[PDB]
Amino acid sequence: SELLVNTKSGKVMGTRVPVLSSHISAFLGIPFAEPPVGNMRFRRPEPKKPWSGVWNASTYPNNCQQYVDEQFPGFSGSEMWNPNREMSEDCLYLNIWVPSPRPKSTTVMVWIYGGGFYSGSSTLDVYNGKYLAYTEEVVLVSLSYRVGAFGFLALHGSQEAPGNVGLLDQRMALQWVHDNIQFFGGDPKTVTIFGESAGGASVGMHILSPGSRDLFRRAILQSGSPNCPWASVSVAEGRRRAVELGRNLNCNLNSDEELIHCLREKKPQELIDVEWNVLPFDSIFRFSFVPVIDGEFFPTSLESMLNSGNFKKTQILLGVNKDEGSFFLLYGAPGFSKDSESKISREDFMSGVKLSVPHANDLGLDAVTLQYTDWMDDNNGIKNRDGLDDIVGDHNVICPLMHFVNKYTKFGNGTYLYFFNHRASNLVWPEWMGVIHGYEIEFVFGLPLVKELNYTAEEEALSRRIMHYWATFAKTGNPNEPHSQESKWPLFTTKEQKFIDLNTEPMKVHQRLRVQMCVFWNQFLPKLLNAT
Amino acid sequence: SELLVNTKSGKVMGTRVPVLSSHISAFLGIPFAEPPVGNMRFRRPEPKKPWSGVWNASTYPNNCQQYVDEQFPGFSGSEMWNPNREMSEDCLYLNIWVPSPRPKSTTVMVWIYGGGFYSGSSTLDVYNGKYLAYTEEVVLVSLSYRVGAFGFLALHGSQEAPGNVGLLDQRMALQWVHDNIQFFGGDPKTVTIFGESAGGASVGMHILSPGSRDLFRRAILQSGSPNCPWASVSVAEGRRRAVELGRNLNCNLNSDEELIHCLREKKPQELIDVEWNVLPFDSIFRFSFVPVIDGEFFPTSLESMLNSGNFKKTQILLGVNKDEGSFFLLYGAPGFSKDSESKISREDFMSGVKLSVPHANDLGLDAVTLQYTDWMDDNNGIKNRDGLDDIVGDHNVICPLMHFVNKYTKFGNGTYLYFFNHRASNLVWPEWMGVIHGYEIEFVFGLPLVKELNYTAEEEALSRRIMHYWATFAKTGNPNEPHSQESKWPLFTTKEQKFIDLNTEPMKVHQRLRVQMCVFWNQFLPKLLNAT
């Protein structure tokens, strides 16, 4: 009765799951799209044709076709990110957690996973929405979208494989929530989208895309933003990559129509096996199939939209972690190791710089080297490691986000900036990697409230603060509660540029987050690469 | 009798001058060149024609024709550098200080005054050679040379105005000393040339010039070196300025002989009046008529000589002051006179960076600006002033010198490096100016030993240490006396790059003098400008 809901696409039968020492309602694996199989591969999503009967919505769905990481088999630190369900091109489903009893028009939070646009799943243990929905009494949605070539193969001009179809997937899950979340207790006019990494960049792209603005109220961006250097490509580069993929598979390259149907015949993992061979450089923190600046989803360049103010004006709550770069060096760089302190010689440092700014010329790599080398001590293995770490995070995550924060605040109505730098007490990774990319997610989603997972009671409190900041921001557009006595998180302003620390210690206010290095990455280095 | 010496050019008779509580011999205004007057203006010096009689060498000679500083009339801090004798083109004379009774073949130190190649005099109170000669029992010579257009008008190809004739003036005074110092008790085989600023750059140039190498033994360079950006010009740039000097005096410009003929009919002060108008840019720490890279005095470019080791191999002692750039900013950048101290606004800072690096394109100016700005605090008047202060010293003095000390030590037979950072307790300048360009000269020459000049007893001790380091180095090629128990000044080597501090505190040994900023000035910025 509570688990039997009559949507505009059919009836859905949920299930009563346990949370903490209570229960709530879960509606798992509801489809919002026609399965993009067959010659519907690479194509714009089509709305799910409505169904008679009762859709069984009591089990997690499939995960989309993606490259599976086998770097450290059996290791929980890395397997926690892999698909925990079967993979299938039939994967466009969403999950809904409803408090119990079902509320009356309560605040909706829609979660978009990251994973560099090539991986990701809605069904991961650390994206379990029961804790956040129960504690803050919000209705928690998590969607999905096609990743890799299946979601972002771009042959602009063709309508067979136009590009950005994985973003269009996310838009159709937002459109479904707009049309149906009211039947679950959710208020369609108070919906907050939020995601991390490629999901944070996705959030920002819906802020900018005109066809997406009317489908959500406000936005949270965690360690990602639409202007990141790994998040977009030109229609030329995306066409170069798509053609290069057909070459790798012996496809007819005479026309698109011939290329697209050649690729539609291959098995999904046939594409995945050659996915990485299309990248133009040797790189870390670069991914093959990503959104394109097509002129449709994005009417002009991202920067000219941020300049003119051509985007949704609302409130945003965003931030970054302390060591966004570390695990990307673990995986792709010389001298690092999961079971070692990972001191790195000057020769490996200059190699890492090359992998990390793969587009620069020699003048640019010299500039980057100069900015992060302590020439009084240039063979200090620790300083070289920490230095290259900061390079990856600053270039790929922090300084792109900071540039997005400064342009958005000009026209927006409320900006709340955070810096996350608590290292979880139970972390399975070596401590040289500090606060790792993606590792604030377990605090956002309430997992420190489970005694079984062996957090400290101060981490439970930190997790409860974050869940509240997030949910309160989702309801009111402001993460602080009026008339309380907890210290207030200040508005980031164009003039004072304030932000807070998120950790177990009392809240400190700082200003100008990593400004010295982001003037280099956002102002000086682009000028030097454009002039040479 | 002691005072009566028979040289290879004639007899000379000096005077018995008092030094502290004693006396020494002094031979003032001895000529070493035919007066470069009339049609000898701008032309290589000719050896003094030997005279009959007794040359009266008991008074200082004239100072060469030069631009006179009238920025702060009557103010000793600046007037102590101005000519204190009459100005005349008949100025090629040298001074000698000889201990009494006359030593037999003792060590000779030859002083070369600085002044940016446009000013300078051997006769200043601060170059009073009597103290160093008496205290260290050395024969102290100070030469002279033509400055400004009179010494460095370069019309390459012409033999009427070739260029570098002021460096040749210096060479002829060194040749005179090589031929005659033995008659005064000096050992022509133990000659040390030493100079500050343009003198230090001159000293380095004699190390480099094959025609000068056999005229001296070792070398001391103070706050100058030959590769400084203000110390040399191409034959083209030198030609462009020589012509533009004639254009300013409405001279014929159809040929070198008519340009030269025109400029020898103008009175000296005419040329001085127009001298500053031929600089290519608005600038500070740039001078109009400087040595030229001609292929005779310097067979190839300064860098190719250093890379290849084409220079005299011996021992050098060299160093810099803490605040080389301050007085160039006081004199030349407004903003340094809008404040009691000299807190400068951010807009004054960006303008100074333009007047300090007069050859950089806007990309180079952004690079300089970015390197010296604290973007957490960019409106700090003190940080802005101090920042541009270092820019002027690092670019013009410290980092040109460190490039020279590193290239030389690969091939040389011994390098000693110093950092002078004492502020005299009796300085007439404001405190923000620090340790000013040229204010170690008073310690080198023993002035703190005069009670009437009210230095502290700790500074008299510092001046005795300096004179000894200088004189011992002049005698043995090493400033330390071994057998001593006093702290030892270590060699600068290619690997450890050690240097010491000169002040009243006990000796400290550092490494890599200002290496972070000199990597910027000496490798990154030159290649930034090479590219654009």
Ligand SMILES: C[N@@H+](Cc1ccnc(NC(=O)Nc2cccc3c2[C@@H]2CCCCN2C3=O)c1)Cc1cn(CCNC2=c3ccccc3=NC3CCCCC23)nn1
């Ligand atoms: C960088 N990623 C790896 C990668 C793998 C394979 N290949 C490349 N790159 C290449 O270039 N490969 C390549 C491979 C073989 C041959 C060639 C080439 C290149 C291609 C170009 C031309 C030359 N090449 C070749 O011949 C990069 C890094 C990466 C991996 N995960 C998935 C794991 N999830 C995560 C984590 C994992 C650990 C810790 C924290 C994590 N937090 C997060 C938060 C966001 C969700 C995912 C996530 N996420 N990010």
Ligand SMILES: C[N@@H+](Cc1ccnc(NC(=O)Nc2cccc3c2[C@@H]2CCCCN2C3=O)c1)Cc1cn(CCNC2=c3ccccc3=NC3CCCCC23)nn1
């Ligand atoms: C650089 N000096 C100034 C200067 C004067 C005149 N003019 C320029 N520069 C220009 O650009 N002038 C200019 C003037 C008028 C019109 C135009 C232009 C420009 C020319 C370019 C095109 C456009 N312009 C014009 O239309 C610079 C600075 C300078 C001055 N002293 C002589 C003083 N002795 C010294 C000191 C003095 C005080 C403290 C420490 C000192 N320690 C030393 C140590 C070394 C011996 C000298 C010395 N030494 N250094």
Ligand SMILES: *[C@@H]1O[C@H](CO)[C@@H](O)[C@H](O)[C@H]1NC(C)=O
């Ligand atoms: C829904 O699916 C699960 C397993 O796929 C099954 O055990 C459960 O009984 C189903 N519920 C129905 C058919 O009502």
Ligand SMILES: *[C@@H]1O[C@H](CO)[C@@H](O)[C@H](O)[C@H]1NC(C)=O
């Ligand atoms: C947001 O917009 C409202 C409506 O114009 C305005 O009253 C409010 O002050 C704005 N807030 C911010 C932080 O810009």
Ligand SMILES: *[C@@H]1O[C@H](CO)[C@@H](O)[C@H](O)[C@H]1NC(C)=O
């Ligand atoms: C948490 O700690 C308990 C007690 O030490 C242990 O039995 C359990 O296996 C731990 N859980 C995890 C997930 O490590």
Ligand SMILES: *[C@@H]1O[C@H](CO)[C@@H](O)[C@H](O)[C@H]1NC(C)=O
């Ligand atoms: C040399 O000149 C000085 C200064 O005028 C004078 O006192 C001295 O008598 C002169 N010597 C001779 C021998 O004339």
Ligand SMILES: *[C@@H]1O[C@H](CO)[C@@H](O)[C@H](O)[C@H]1NC(C)=O
């Ligand atoms: C200087 O040269 C001598 C003789 O050739 C040599 O033995 C000595 O080691 C050298 N010293 C330095 C410091 O280079």
Ligand SMILES: *[C@@H]1O[C@H](CO)[C@@H](O)[C@H](O)[C@H]1NC(C)=O
């Ligand atoms: C030297 O210092 C003393 C004591 O401070 C002072 O009285 C004297 O007048 C000073 N001498 C000069 C020439 O300024």
Ligand SMILES: [Cl-]
């Ligand atoms: Cl094509």
Ligand SMILES: [Cl-]
């Ligand atoms: Cl298939």
Ligand SMILES: [Cl-]
């Ligand atoms: Cl080490």
Ligand SMILES: [Cl-]
């Ligand atoms: Cl760390």
Ligand SMILES: [Cl-]
């Ligand atoms: Cl604002």
Ligand SMILES: [Cl-]
């Ligand atoms: Cl005296």
Ligand SMILES: [Cl-]
């Ligand atoms: Cl000797």
Ligand SMILES: [Cl-]
């Ligand atoms: Cl000409």
